[PDB]
């Protein structure tokens, strides 16, 4: 966390507090009936003309949580518990799916997955990286501007704050490892059309948010920043047409008070 | 070099933090981070890949603050690294290969080499050849005087990872008989359907100290970052396949170590 002088941990009757919320997935939400899905995915006519519609693009989810006011003292995020909410829903293999074979059940949700979650004293800081720099990201999303071929591997122009929902497409932004001093981020990409979902749930697993120096994220502005993505895979419709399917993520963050100079 | 005690005090630690880009073959002005669509030799004997079909080791020499018989050297103590731009692999709509009627495109997948090293000098390479009759293309540094023994082991094929866009990945490996002064880590997963699995986190530190609590020592006040991250192949609409690479972030803690001679 750092940036300011991190002094000693204040103890007492009111030195600890808890945030506990859920973050919903923005998977593209085609129509009034498909919250948590994307629009059935289409493929560009040409490599040069890639231009996905906004409702075909999953996005990072973010939540600013206001904490009990202080004043310096700052709130220190100490522990996280998180799990994906509604894992069993992925066993619904009967809702106009693709029969895997004659008299087969539907092909279950599976394939390319990004499970990611961050706890920060400020916005998650993003670096842009593009699969194809000539991809035209659709009106209404915040995307890397002034894309060059260098954007495809690394281009330090593409910095940004995860400060808005339904905004930052997943496929062109990643945590910027050159700057998230005040955030703890964890994510995994598994790529492949047949990748099986593997989702663990438990109320027994705590993750500690303290760094090498025993300091957790420090909540600037008395704000805690929960960010998450949980693209679980794709739903295969009867036709074979595929929609990304997302799930909400639970957070419970223990916080304590840290004395700070300036 | 006899290694003496660790200097502590007001300015005894320092940090390098950079990114290394991937040299995957970079066909044309528009395809940085890809290889050229892969072709297959007419015969086993005539294997001769074009330079733009050959991923290469990436290397970066970082000059450190000046310090200096009884002298000081920078000791690399910890590394943090992750692949930058993992999410970009979810782009399944950019003229890919529909896995089936109305399917999304086949995502980047298949044969992968993720490798990274931290050294007080160049990574030291041993040459090993899949096929010793393979002619490595004009403009790459490759094993010279290939014999059939080159296919299993041939100690002639030594070299320094001292140049970018130079050393093809498929004919060089870290030389395990050397690299005293480097810490290297890599994994090959082979197979056309191997799923990419890329973890990212700013919470994972790796220690670079050996059995004796000494990290790499930066000869000439230079730190050597080497990396390869061939993530898999992009399958075009035609079925033609291009290697796809990604940048690697490094952040290395260094401290000062007293040394004789």
């Amino acid at each position: 966390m750092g940036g300011v002088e991190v002094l000693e941990v204040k103890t007492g009757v009111d030195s600890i507090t808890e945030v506990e919320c859920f973050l919903t997935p923005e998977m593209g939400d085609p129509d009034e009936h498909l919250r948590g899905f994307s629009k059935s995915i289409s493929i560009s006519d040409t490599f040069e003309s890639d231009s996905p519609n906004r409702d075909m693009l999953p996005c990072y989810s973010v939540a600013r949580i206001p904490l009990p006011n202080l004043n310096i003292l700052m709130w220190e995020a100490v522990t996280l518990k998180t799990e994906v909410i509604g894992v069993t829903s992925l066993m619904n293999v009967h809702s106009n799916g693709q029969a895997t074979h004659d008299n087969g059940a539907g092909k279950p949700v599976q394939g390319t997955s990004f499970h990611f979650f961050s706890v920060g004293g400020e916005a998650l800081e993003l670096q842009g990286v593009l699969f194809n720099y000539r991809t035209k990201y659709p009106d209404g999303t915040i995307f890397p501007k002034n894309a060059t071929v260098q954007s495809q591997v690394m281009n330090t122009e593409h910095k940004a704050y995860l400060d808005k929902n339904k905004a930052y497409p997943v496929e062109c932004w990643v945590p910027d490892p050159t700057r998230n001093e005040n955030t703890r981020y964890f994510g995994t990409l598994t790529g492949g059309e047949n990748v099986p979902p593997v989702l663990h749930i438990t109320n027994t697993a705590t993750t500690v948010l303290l760094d090498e120096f025993g300091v957790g994220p420090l909540c600037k502005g008395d704000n805690l920043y929960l960010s998450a993505v949980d693209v679980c895979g794709m739903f295969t419709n009867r036709s074979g047409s595929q929609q990304w399917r997302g799930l909400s993520r639970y957070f419970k963050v223990q916080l304590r008070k840290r004395r700070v100079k300036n | 070099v006899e290694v003496l005690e660790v200097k502590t005090g007001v300015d005894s630690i320092t940090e390098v933090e950079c990114f290394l880009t991937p040299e995957m073959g970079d066909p044309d002005e528009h395809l940085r981070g890809f290889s050229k669509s892969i072709s297959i030799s007419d015969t086993f004997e005539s294997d001769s890949p074009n330079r733009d079909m050959l991923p290469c080791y990436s290397v970066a020499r970082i000059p450190l603050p000046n310090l200096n018989g009884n002298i000081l050297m920078w000791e690399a103590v910890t590394l943090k690294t992750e692949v930058i731009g993992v999410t970009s692999l979810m782009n399944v709509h950019s003229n890919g290969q529909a896995t089936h009627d109305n399917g999304a495109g086949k995502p980047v997948q298949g044969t992968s080499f993720h490798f990274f090293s931290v050294g007080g000098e160049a990574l030291e390479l041993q040459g090993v050849l899949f096929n010793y009759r393979t002619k490595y293309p004009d403009g790459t540094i490759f094993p010279k005087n290939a014999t059939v023994q080159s296919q299993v082991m041939n100690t002639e094929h030594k070299a320094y990872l001292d140049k970018n866009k130079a050393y093809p990945v498929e004919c060089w490996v870290p030389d395990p008989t050397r690299n005293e002064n480097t810490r290297y880590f890599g994994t090959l997963t082979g197979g056309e359907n191997v799923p990419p699995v890329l973890h990212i986190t700013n919470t994972a530190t790796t220690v670079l100290l050996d059995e004796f609590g000494v990290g790499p020592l930066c000869k000439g006040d230079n730190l050597y970052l080497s990396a390869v991250d061939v993530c898999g192949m992009f399958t075009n609409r035609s079925g033609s396949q291009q290697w796809r690479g990604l940048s690697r972030y490094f952040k290395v803690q260094l401290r000062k170590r007293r040394v004789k001679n």
Epitope: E48 | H30, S48, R237
Partner: antibody
Framework: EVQLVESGGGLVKPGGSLRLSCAAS????????MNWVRQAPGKGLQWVSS????????YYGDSVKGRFTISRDNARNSLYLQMNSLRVEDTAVYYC???????????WGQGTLVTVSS | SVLTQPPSASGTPGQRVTISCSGG????????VNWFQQFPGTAPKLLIY???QRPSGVPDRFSGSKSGTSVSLAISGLQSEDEGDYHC???????????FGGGTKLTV
């Protein structure tokens, strides 16, 4: 649909000059490398010249090295071929063709006739 | 660094005809072949791309095979509407340009 339309072709005397126009409608012309290919009456096809999306890379067939010049105006959705020092052999239908990655040369225009005679 | 295809080919309606295109490492070895179909007094049109692939609108009858430096086009279930010139094309890395074949007039 994608439509390319060539124009500017006609009758010109040896040593003569001539500017050909390709009008692109149906696609972002500014995103693709574009080609000229010609066909001498009764003979096969022969590539003339390529130009990159941003006019960074122009290439020419040897048969017209030094005489022809390719150019594009991405604002006017138009590809041009400047033909100087025209010869009898240069008589052909001049096709305008798009190159797309993986698809390679895909769409052709209707062609425009260039006859160089006395 | 020239593409060599038969100047003419022919067949009986219903037959499979095969037009070959032979190049070198500099072109077909390292670069894909597109086939273009040309009827008299019209432009060339894309028939096969990337050695072996059909754009939408080309019947299953039309097919390709690649073996190293040589490719072939296969017109199966030959029909009269298939009478025309078949053009073989591929990029050449050394000439930095497109090379074509002679053309193949298919008579039925």
């Amino acid at each position: 649909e994608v439509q390319l339309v060539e124009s500017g072709g006609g009758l010109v005397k040896p040593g003569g000059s001539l500017r050909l126009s390709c009008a692109a409608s149906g696609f972002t012309f500014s995103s693709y490398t574009m080609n000229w290919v010609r066909q001498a009456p009764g003979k096969g096809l022969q590539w003339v010249s390529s130009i990159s999306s941003s006019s960074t890379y122009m290439y020419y067939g040897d048969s017209v090295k030094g005489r022809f010049t390719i150019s594009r105006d991405n604002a006017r959705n138009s590809l041009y071929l400047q033909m100087n020092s025209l010869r009898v052999e240069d008589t052909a239908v001049y096709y305008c063709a798009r190159y797309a990655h993986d698809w390679n040369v895909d769409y052709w225009g209707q062609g425009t006739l260039v006859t160089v005679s006395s | 660094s020239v593409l060599t295809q038969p100047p003419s080919a022919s067949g009986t309606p219903g037959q499979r005809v095969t037009i070959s295109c032979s190049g070198g490492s500099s072109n077909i070895g390292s670069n894909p072949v597109n086939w273009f179909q040309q009827f008299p007094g019209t432009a060339p049109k894309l028939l096969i791309y990337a050695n072996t692939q059909r754009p939408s609108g080309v019947p299953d009858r039309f097919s390709g095979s690649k073996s190293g430096t040589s490719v072939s086009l296969a017109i199966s279930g030959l029909q009269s509407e298939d009478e025309g010139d078949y053009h073989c094309a591929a990029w050449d890395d050394s000439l930095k340009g497109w090379v074509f074949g002679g053309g193949t007039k298919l008579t039925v």
